[PDB]
């Protein structure tokens, strides 16, 4: 069993726009299904539901004449009309099945993220971070990748390609003025590096963008 | 749209701690749903109709409740039991869910590793300083961290991001950016990060100076 969404990603507020949700595993033909919202950093928030038929879709009341609930059973596909966005519609959009007809949402796909705004698309500097110009008497040595300036989010930090795993922290975006900045720390022992490559990897879809920063030590 | 109210909103709780969380409605509910969420998966169905535990959720799980007050109780607590809960009503429409609690688990206090790292050549070359700092790896999340330049405290363009409870550790860490023009950076001598945690009455300091 599972559920994919799709048609997401950046739009302006005023704007419209058309989710879809995929399912396959099961008869969708025979279940109520059902989308899901939750804003970043919030709670889940109740779209609608809609029948096997069409013939019964239930909504929030606010929204229920922006947003457009409807399937295609030939198709396996469900979808949400989304019709003037604005910037509380801002969310990750979860598709569901509402298990039999009673009661319960217990299959749920990951959701399609959604970011209304004017702001327009932009890619991240990347810097790397050595530690202080010095040589410490230390067993192991933090490196620091800074990734500033982006919108909208996701970005993606992977260390040497997603082969160094343990010993990294990725924290969290934080916004500023229109755009993103976040950070990522790994530690490693002092033999390791500077004597071998670590690189930051950090790759922005949004712009297309994907750039490696390697952290080679100061210098003058 | 009967509105649910969940409590606490926020809890840590010792591995073994029993652990309830209470859902209320605006309005009598004939039913309770209950969903647990992990950082990055979607919702996860925990409980059906009130007291009924969903397919693989382990048996110190439990519900109950009736009319405007229901609850979920861990007998037991642990580590993989640390996330997000929320409720569900489907007795009337709009089907609407609690604000959600957030549960984390107890561990041993830890003293933060803190690490400073000056600008970068190449952002400088831009007319831009970032000086960054990493609290690394302490418990509990409660933690200061100041800036000061040459030595004196410094308030403007501080820029902080907790990261979740590892799932290694159970331990936090947070990072501290302080951002200058670098015009503004070229003028001062010493840089400083400084951390007070409860695990020290001492505060743990970095610092560096330029050239």
């Known amino acids: 069993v599972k559920l994919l969404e799709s048609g997401g990603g950046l739009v302006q507020p005023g704007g419209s726009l058309k989710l879809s949700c995929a399912a396959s595993?099961?008869?969708?033909?025979?279940?109520?299904m059902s989308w899901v919202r939750q804003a970043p950093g919030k709670g889940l928030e109740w779209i609608g539901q809609?029948?096997?038929?069409?013939?019964?879709?239930n909504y929030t009341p606010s929204l229920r004449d922006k947003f457009i609930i409807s399937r295609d059973n030939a198709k396996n596909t469900l979808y949400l009309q989304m019709t003037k966005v604005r910037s509380e519609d801002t969310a990750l959009y979860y598709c569901?099945?509402?298990?039999?007809?009673?009661?319960?949402?217990?299959?749920w796909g990951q959701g399609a993220s959604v970011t209304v705004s004017s702001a327009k698309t932009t890619p991240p500097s990347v810097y790397p971070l050595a530690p202080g110009r010095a040589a410490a008497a230390a067993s192991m040595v933090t490196l620091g990748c800074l990734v500033k300036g982006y919108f909208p989010e996701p970005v993606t930090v992977t260390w040497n390609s997603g082969s160094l795993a343990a010993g990294v922290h990725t924290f969290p975006a934080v916004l500023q003025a229109a755009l993103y900045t976040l950070s990522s720390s790994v530690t490693v022992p002092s033999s390791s590096w500077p004597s071998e490559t670590v690189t930051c990897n950090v790759a922005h879809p949004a712009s297309s963008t994907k750039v490696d920063k390697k952290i080679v030590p100061r210098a003058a | 749209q009967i509105v649910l109210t969940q409590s606490p909103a926020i809890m840590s709780a010792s591995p073994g701690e029993k652990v309830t969380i209470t859902c209320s409605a605006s309005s009598s509910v004939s039913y309770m749903h209950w969903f647990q969420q992990k950082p990055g998966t979607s919702p996860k169905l925990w409980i059906y109709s009130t007291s009924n535990l969903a397919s693989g959720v382990p048996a110190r799980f439990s519900g109950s409740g009736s009319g405007t007050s229901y609850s979920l109780t861990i007998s037991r607590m642990e580590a993989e039991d640390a996330a997000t809960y929320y409720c569900?009503?489907?007795?009337?429409?709009?089907?609407?869910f609690g604000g959600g609690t957030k549960l984390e688990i107890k561990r041993a206090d830890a003293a933060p590793t803190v690490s400073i790292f000056p600008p970068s050549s190449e952002q400088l070359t831009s007319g831009g300083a970032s000086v960054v700092c990493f609290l690394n790896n302490f418990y509990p999340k409660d933690i200061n961290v100041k800036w000061k330049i040459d030595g004196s405290e410094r308030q403007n363009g501080v820029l902080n991001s907790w990261t979740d409870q590892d799932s290694k550790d159970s331990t936090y860490s947070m990072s501290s950016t302080l951002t200058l023009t670098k015009d503004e950076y070229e003028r001062h001598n010493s840089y400083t990060c400084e951390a007070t945690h409860k695990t020290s009455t001492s505060p743990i300091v970095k610092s560096f100076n330029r050239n």
């Open positions: 569901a099945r509402l298990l039999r007809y009673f009661y319960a949402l217990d299959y």
């Open positions: 595993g099961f008869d969708f033909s025979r279940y109520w």
């Open positions: 569900q009503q489907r007795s009337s429409y709009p089907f609407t």
């Open positions: 809609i029948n096997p038929h069409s013939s019964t879709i």
